[PDB]
Scaffold this active site. Structure first.
Site, PDB file in Angstrom:
ATOM      1  N   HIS A 265       0.800  -1.222   0.000  1.00  0.00           N
ATOM      2  CA  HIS A 265       0.000   0.000   0.000  1.00  0.00           C
ATOM      3  C   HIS A 265       0.835   1.274   0.000  1.00  0.00           C
ATOM      4  CE1 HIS A 265       0.202   0.220   4.573  1.00  0.00           C
ATOM      5  NE2 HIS A 265       0.296   1.497   4.249  1.00  0.00           N
TER       6      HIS A 265
ATOM      7  N   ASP B 200      -0.220  -7.495   1.852  1.00  0.00           N
ATOM      8  CA  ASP B 200       0.333  -6.145   1.862  1.00  0.00           C
ATOM      9  C   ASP B 200       1.853  -6.233   1.893  1.00  0.00           C
ATOM     10  OD1 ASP B 200       0.515  -3.442   1.899  1.00  0.00           O
ATOM     11  OD2 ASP B 200      -0.283  -3.155   3.940  1.00  0.00           O
TER      12      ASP B 200
ATOM     13  N   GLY C 200       3.151   6.444   8.548  1.00  0.00           N
ATOM     14  CA  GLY C 200       4.545   6.743   8.291  1.00  0.00           C
ATOM     15  C   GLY C 200       5.469   5.590   8.648  1.00  0.00           C
TER      16      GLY C 200
ATOM     17  N   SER D  38       4.446   2.346   8.110  1.00  0.00           N
ATOM     18  CA  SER D  38       4.078   1.282   7.168  1.00  0.00           C
ATOM     19  C   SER D  38       5.236   0.858   6.293  1.00  0.00           C
ATOM     20  CB  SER D  38       2.940   1.726   6.246  1.00  0.00           C
ATOM     21  OG  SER D  38       1.742   1.906   6.963  1.00  0.00           O
ATOM     22  N   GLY D  39       5.289  -0.435   5.990  1.00  0.00           N
ATOM     23  CA  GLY D  39       6.350  -0.965   5.158  1.00  0.00           C
ATOM     24  C   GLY D  39       7.591  -1.280   5.968  1.00  0.00           C
TER      25      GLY D  39
HETATM   26  C1  LIG Z   1       0.944   1.997  10.751  1.00  0.00           C
HETATM   27  C2  LIG Z   1       0.001   1.920   9.817  1.00  0.00           C
HETATM   28  C3  LIG Z   1      -0.961   3.000   9.413  1.00  0.00           C
HETATM   29  C4  LIG Z   1      -1.742   2.632   8.158  1.00  0.00           C
HETATM   30  C5  LIG Z   1      -3.083   3.320   8.116  1.00  0.00           C
HETATM   31  O1  LIG Z   1      -3.250   3.846   6.823  1.00  0.00           O
HETATM   32  C6  LIG Z   1      -4.268   2.419   8.489  1.00  0.00           C
HETATM   33  O2  LIG Z   1      -5.274   3.080   9.226  1.00  0.00           O
END
Ligand SMILES: C=CCC[C@@H](O)CO
Ligand SMILES: C=CCC[C@H](O)CO
Ligand SMILES: [Ca+2]
Length: 240
Positions: free
Chosen positions: A45, A93, A186, A188-189
């Site tokens: 994502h 993901d 921020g 994520s990944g």
């Molecule tokens: C740490 C992940 C945050 C991702 C968001 O977009 C989901 O609510």
């Protein structure tokens, strides 16, 4: 990362910053893990949108020159074939980025260790989440790399009605949920480093948190389980 503390600048050398160009400047958007000198693992994502991306390794402070950064472009993006932008709860993901150049390994730039295929961690295993994400729900990004203790919460429990219920799958790992510490926009990944056999291995790729907020009791941070994609990962790096 909410409720974390600044990390020592050489604690997590496989951590990378994924950035995109906004007009004439670059902005941090996600984290990632260096798994090959020219390969980076991150969340699907994070690379869903069609923008110009670049990876920064050996980074510690986003706004300051540390004297150890390496900037390299991204030439190829391989998203998992079953990923669906509108159904993050469905899993998958995860994405692999082939870098335009092979980074130079040193004290600040190392490869992250991946777990053996199918490995499941026992409930409450010791792990740490790292990232430059929001330090508060609806807050702002962290200037310096943050880390926080986030022990796992097994599937049985995480998928129970009192937690995430049916929104969590066996292809995911849950960690935290004490209402104080968590991943946040921020992060994520990014990686979920877990101590196994005296070694820290990357068992998760930060995927999502609650709509209610980042640090919510009974709502641990959800990660893509890396050990369930080992074959896919090797097959991609083997033919690309
Ligand atoms: C740490 C992940 C945050 C991702 C968001 O977009 C989901 O609510
Ligand atoms: C190029 C540096 C990273 C910028 C951050 O997203 C916030 O200023
Ligand atoms: Ca810097």
């Amino acid at each position: 990362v909410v409720g974390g503390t600044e990390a020592q600048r050489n604690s997590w050398p496989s951590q990378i910053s994924l950035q995109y160009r906004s007009g004439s400047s670059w902005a941090h958007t996600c984290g990632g893990t260096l798994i090959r000198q020219n390969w980076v693992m991150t969340a699907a994502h994070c690379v869903d949108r069609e923008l110009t991306f670049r990876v920064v390794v050996g980074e510690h402070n986003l706004n300051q020159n540390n004297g150890t950064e390496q900037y390299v472009g991204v030439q190829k993006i391989v998203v998992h074939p079953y990923w669906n932008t509108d159904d993050v709860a469905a899993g998958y993901d995860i994405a692999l980025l082939r870098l335009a150049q092979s980074v130079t390994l040193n004290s600040y730039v190392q490869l992250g260790v991946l777990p053996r295929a199918g490995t499941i961690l026992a409930n409450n295993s010791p792990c740490y989440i790292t990232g430059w994400g929001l330090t508060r729900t609806n807050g702002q990004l962290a200037q310096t790399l943050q880390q926080a203790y986030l022990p796992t919460v097994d599937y049985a429990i995480c998928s129970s009605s009192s937690y995430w219920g049916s929104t969590v799958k066996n292809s995911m790992v849950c960690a935290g949920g004490d209402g104080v510490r968590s991943g946040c926009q921020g992060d994520s990944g990014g990686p979920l480093h877990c101590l196994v056999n005296g070694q820290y291995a990357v068992h998760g790729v930060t995927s999502f948190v609650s709509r209610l907020g980042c640090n919510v009791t009974r709502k641990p941070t959800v990660f893509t389980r890396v050990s369930a994609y080992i074959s896919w990962i090797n097959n991609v790096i083997a033919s690309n």
